[PDB]
């Protein structure tokens, strides 16, 4: 995206650092959610809770991409 | 004339974001501990939901910093 960032380069180093840390966490989390998906439960409540977690994983993924684009455009 | 904000106000918003990041870290440590103390798919699911929300909060704090320091 365009240029013109107006904040500390030091923060831009460290925010990329934490975003990367958050991507690592996310991958490990999607691994845990995957495992939980196939490893065990026949209940409508249980199925719904798992779908809620699985959805939130995607929300977190898209927000990480949003934070990356905003970070390198800002 | 796009942005019109007081420098002191933007500095105090950066502080509030910092304090919220500290709260987040303490929250993630709290969850690491409580998760590590624990066979239920619901309980595991709630734990995964909390971990996700912590990740969401991380990304929104980074977004809030980026949007704040480009205003």
């Amino acid at each position: 995206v365009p240029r013109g960032s107006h904040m500390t380069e030091d923060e831009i180093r460290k925010l990329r650092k934490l975003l990367e840390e958050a991507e690592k966490k996310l991958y490990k989390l999607e691994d845990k959610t995957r495992r939980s998906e196939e490893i065990s439960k026949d209940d409508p409540k249980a199925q719904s809770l798992q779908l809620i977690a699985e959805s939130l994983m995607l929300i977190a993924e898209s927000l990480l991409i949003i934070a990356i684009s905003l970070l390198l455009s800002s | 004339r796009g942005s019109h904000m007081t420098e002191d106000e933007i500095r105090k918003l950066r502080k509030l974001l910092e304090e919220a990041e500290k709260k987040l870290y303490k929250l993630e440590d709290k969850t690491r501990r409580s998760e590590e103390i624990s066979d239920d798919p619901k309980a595991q699911s709630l734990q995964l939901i909390a971990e996700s929300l912590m990740l969401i909060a991380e990304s929104l704090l980074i977004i809030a910093i980026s949007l704040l320091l480009s205003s």
Binding site: D10, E11 | I10
Partner: peptide, 6 residues
């Protein structure tokens, strides 16, 4: 994650 701006 810590900065000032104006």
């Amino acid at each position: 994650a810590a900065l000032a701006a104006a």
